[PDB]
Design a protein around this ligand. Structure first.
Ligand SMILES: NC(=O)c1ccc[n+]([C@@H]2O[C@H](COP(=O)([O-])OP(=O)(O)OC[C@H]3O[C@@H](n4cnc5c(N)ncnc54)[C@H](OP(=O)(O)O)[C@@H]3O)[C@@H](O)[C@H]2O)c1
Ligand SMILES: O=C(NCc1ccc(Cl)cc1)c1n[nH]c([N+](=O)[O-])c1Cl
Length: 315
């Protein structure tokens, strides 16, 4: 089940999230990506940041080599990390990701974040207060570099991630724009449902892709443990009992019914298979209204590390 993007390529509407924190052994990403393809996932979300592209790429190539899928059946995404926003660094970062995955192309390459970081060896160059060391880059010039990558065939489609509406607007009104972003991948779930951003994306034929749709991995680097746990929400739980589903399935189905493409990360064999059940049932209009009521402007990513950055999108 696929949505047609504004460049004419096609994106599966449920995607598998591959990130696991560093205490998870690298080899697991390989195992669980194969499991996710076996279960029916066809859209796979990785990044340079995640340090797993070699494992994710191998899982994909294994599922091609054993005859399970064709390359053309898999939609693989990676992302340009914030230290590589300077235009001259964009193509080389993409080539790096292709060599890691051993793929001839990515189906989608995103600017991972609007918050440009000082170029260098560190993923997160830090200032002493622990604030990321910012860089001033015109993201319009980073976007022109992305467009060159699509023109060379390195990425079939190009898009952005963590952009707010005004940031998206800036790209859209760029003089001489050749390709609009196909998508904006952002934090989106019933506690932060981004309905104003969704409406703007829909008006621009840009797909909103929801990450942390199940409420995030709750990593203490960036997430306050007092924050309400999305999957313990009583309304989602009540809806899970009503449909004899689970609160995750409720959270995933809500996105599809608003025209949002949705990611789900799991490294558990059972939950991976469970998550494809999103296609097996429907929420009613009143169910959707109840879930719309949960919105509380809650982004789980909420650290002093980035909240002072000049291009923080939640400002
Ligand atoms: N563009 C960005 O800046 C950005 C930011 C964050 C994430 N992402 C992408 O989006 C993906 C997903 O977001 P996320 O990693 O924040 O996690 P998520 O999809 O919100 O899932 C959070 C947790 O839900 C659990 N879970 C999954 N299925 C479940 C089920 N059926 N029942 C109960 N619990 C279940 C998982 O634990 P188990 O593994 O134990 O099942 C997972 O750790 C990431 O992996 C990454 O690919 C992108
Ligand atoms: O740093 C990350 N994103 C950049 C980012 C996150 C939030 C905001 Cl507001 C802006 C930029 C990250 N991306 N994916 C994962 N992951 O766990 O899947 C992590 Cl962590």
């Amino acid at each position: 089940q696929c949505v047609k993007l504004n460049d004419g390529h096609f994106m599966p509407v449920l995607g598998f999230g591959t990130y696991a924190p560093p205490e998870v052994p690298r080899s697991k990403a390989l195992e669980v990506t194969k499991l996710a393809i076996e279960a029916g996932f066809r859209h796979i979300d990785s990044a340079h940041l995640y340090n797993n592209e070699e494992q994710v790429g191998l899982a994909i190539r294994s599922k091609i080599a054993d005859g399970s899928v064709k390359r053309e059946d898999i939609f693989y995404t990676s992302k340009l990390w914030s230290t590589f926003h300077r235009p001259e660094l964009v193509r080389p970062a993409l080539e790096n990701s292709l060599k890691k995955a051993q793929l001839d192309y990515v189906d989608l390459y995103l600017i991972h974040s609007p918050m440009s970081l000082k170029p260098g060896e560190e993923l997160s160059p830090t200032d002493e207060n622990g604030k990321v060391i910012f860089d001033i880059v015109d993201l319009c010039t980073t976007w022109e570099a992305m467009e060159k990558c699509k023109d060379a065939g390195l990425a079939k489609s190009i898009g952005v991630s963590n952009f707010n509406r005004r940031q998206l607007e800036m790209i859209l009104n760029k003089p001489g724009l050749k390709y609009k972003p196909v998508c904006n991948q952002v934090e989106c779930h019933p506690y932060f449902n981004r309905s104003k951003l969704l409406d703007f994306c829909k008006s621009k034929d840009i797909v909103l892709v929801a990450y942390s749709a199940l409420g995030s991995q709750r990593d203490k680097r960036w997430v306050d443990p007092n924050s309400p746990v999305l999957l313990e929400d009583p309304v989602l739980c009540a809806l899970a009992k009503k449909h004899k589903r689970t609160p995750a399935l409720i959270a995933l189905r809500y996105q599809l019914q608003r025209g949002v493409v949705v990611l789900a990360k799991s490294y558990n064999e059972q939950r991976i298979r469970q998550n494809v059940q999103v296609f097996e049932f429907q929420l009613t209009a009143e169910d959707m209204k109840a879930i719309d009521g949960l919105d509380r402007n809650l982004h789980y990513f909420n650290s002093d590390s980035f909240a002072s950055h000049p291009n923080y999108p939640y400002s």
